[PDB]
Design an enzyme around this catalytic site. Structure first.
Site, mmCIF file in Angstrom:
data_model
loop_
_atom_site.group_PDB
_atom_site.id
_atom_site.type_symbol
_atom_site.label_atom_id
_atom_site.label_comp_id
_atom_site.label_asym_id
_atom_site.label_seq_id
_atom_site.Cartn_x
_atom_site.Cartn_y
_atom_site.Cartn_z
ATOM 1 N N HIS A 6 16.851 7.315 11.680
ATOM 2 C CA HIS A 6 16.950 7.876 10.336
ATOM 3 C C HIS A 6 18.004 8.962 10.137
ATOM 4 O O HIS A 6 18.555 9.088 9.040
ATOM 5 C CB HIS A 6 15.598 8.448 9.916
ATOM 6 C CG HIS A 6 15.469 8.636 8.441
ATOM 7 N ND1 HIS A 6 15.560 7.590 7.551
ATOM 8 C CD2 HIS A 6 15.281 9.746 7.696
ATOM 9 C CE1 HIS A 6 15.416 8.046 6.321
ATOM 10 N NE2 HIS A 6 15.243 9.352 6.383
ATOM 11 N N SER A 25 18.601 9.772 2.732
ATOM 12 C CA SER A 25 17.224 9.293 2.547
ATOM 13 C C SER A 25 16.873 9.313 1.065
ATOM 14 O O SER A 25 17.499 8.567 0.295
ATOM 15 C CB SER A 25 16.300 10.110 3.453
ATOM 16 O OG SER A 25 15.113 9.384 3.728
ATOM 17 N N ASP A 44 15.974 2.555 11.870
ATOM 18 C CA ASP A 44 15.419 3.487 10.892
ATOM 19 C C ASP A 44 13.986 3.079 10.598
ATOM 20 O O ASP A 44 13.736 2.095 9.898
ATOM 21 C CB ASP A 44 16.268 3.503 9.625
ATOM 22 C CG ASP A 44 15.862 4.601 8.644
ATOM 23 O OD1 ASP A 44 14.669 4.994 8.584
ATOM 24 O OD2 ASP A 44 16.766 5.060 7.914
#
Length: 274
Positions: free
Chosen positions: A214, A136, A182
């Site tokens: 995610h 991320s 995501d």
């Protein structure tokens, strides 16, 4: 060096070896207190029954997330012949650019510890063959470090960042793992334009995983973890190919039909490499 440099280790590989729960080596751990300068501590993973030096890899987490969110990668990679540090961030509020400086700080730490009489990895690291990984916002930090050209391999996991034009400097072999569902870092605004912004001359790879969200590229020892085999097969090989210049692992990145994998929704690449 780029070819026949003598960094290869372990058997000639196969798919069953790659997708085993561990590599051919045994794994130990050494704690890094959070008092460490430059980042918020971590865990060092290393093989016990090898010889010679090996590449170093650091794995960073994402927003308000603990190191444990990515720490599946530590043992999984160390067991194939790497020194692998999973780290924590100074603050869970750290944004991409901070997470990249902390990537570099944890790579600098690993280089220091290779020369420390007190480190279990003293003399075990080739401090020129370095890799980075990140989830991320730490995936954005990974891509940012991939623009500096010190590291020889980058694997962003569900990367999040804000500007994509900065990644046209990326000449470093980058394998971006993306998660189809995501919602946190939408593919179409993040992973997708970051891959596209990388020059076609760079060895790169886009492996979107089928149906996952995610956290789909983080691995898991229990809940979730239907992707462990794509992660293991493609991640280990990518690191083996580009950190250890080990062509014996080329066959798993360049050559197969990846979308034929039930776990791979979309593959994009620049095969062949060199």
């Amino acid at each position: 060096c780029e070819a026949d440099c003598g960094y290869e280790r372990g058997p000639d590989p196969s798919v069953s070896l790659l997708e085993a729960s561990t590599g051919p080596f045994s794994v130990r751990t050494s704690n890094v207190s959070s008092s460490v300068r430059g980042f918020g501590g971590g865990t060092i993973h290393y093989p016990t029954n090898t010889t010679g030096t090996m590449a170093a890899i650091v794995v960073i987490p994402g927003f308000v997330s603990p190191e444990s969110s990515i720490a599946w990668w530590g043992p999984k990679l160390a067991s194939h012949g790497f020194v692998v540090m999973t780290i924590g961030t100074n603050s869970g509020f750290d944004q991409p650019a901070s997470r990249a400086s902390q990537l570099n700080n944890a790579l600098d730490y690993l280089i220091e510890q290779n020369g420390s009489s007190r480190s279990p990895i003293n003399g075990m690291i080739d401090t020129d063959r370095l890799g980075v990984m990140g989830w991320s916002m730490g995936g954005g930090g990974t891509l940012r470090v991939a623009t500096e050209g010190r590291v020889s391999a980058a694997i962003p996991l569900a990367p999040w960042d804000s500007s994509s034009s900065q990644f046209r400097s990326i000449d470093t072999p980058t394998l971006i793992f993306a998660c189809e569902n995501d919602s946190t870092a939408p593919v179409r605004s993040h992973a997708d334009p970051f891959y596209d912004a990388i020059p076609d001359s760079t060895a790169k790879a886009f492996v979107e995983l089928d149906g996952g969200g995610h956290t789909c590229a983080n691995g898991s020892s229990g809940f979730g973890g239907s992707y462990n085999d794509v992660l293991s097969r493609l991640g280990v090989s990518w690191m083996k190919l580009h950190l250890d210049k080990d062509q014996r692992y080329n066959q798993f990145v360049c050559g197969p039909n990846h979308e034929s994998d039930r776990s791979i929704s979309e593959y994009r690449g620049t095969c062949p490499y060199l």
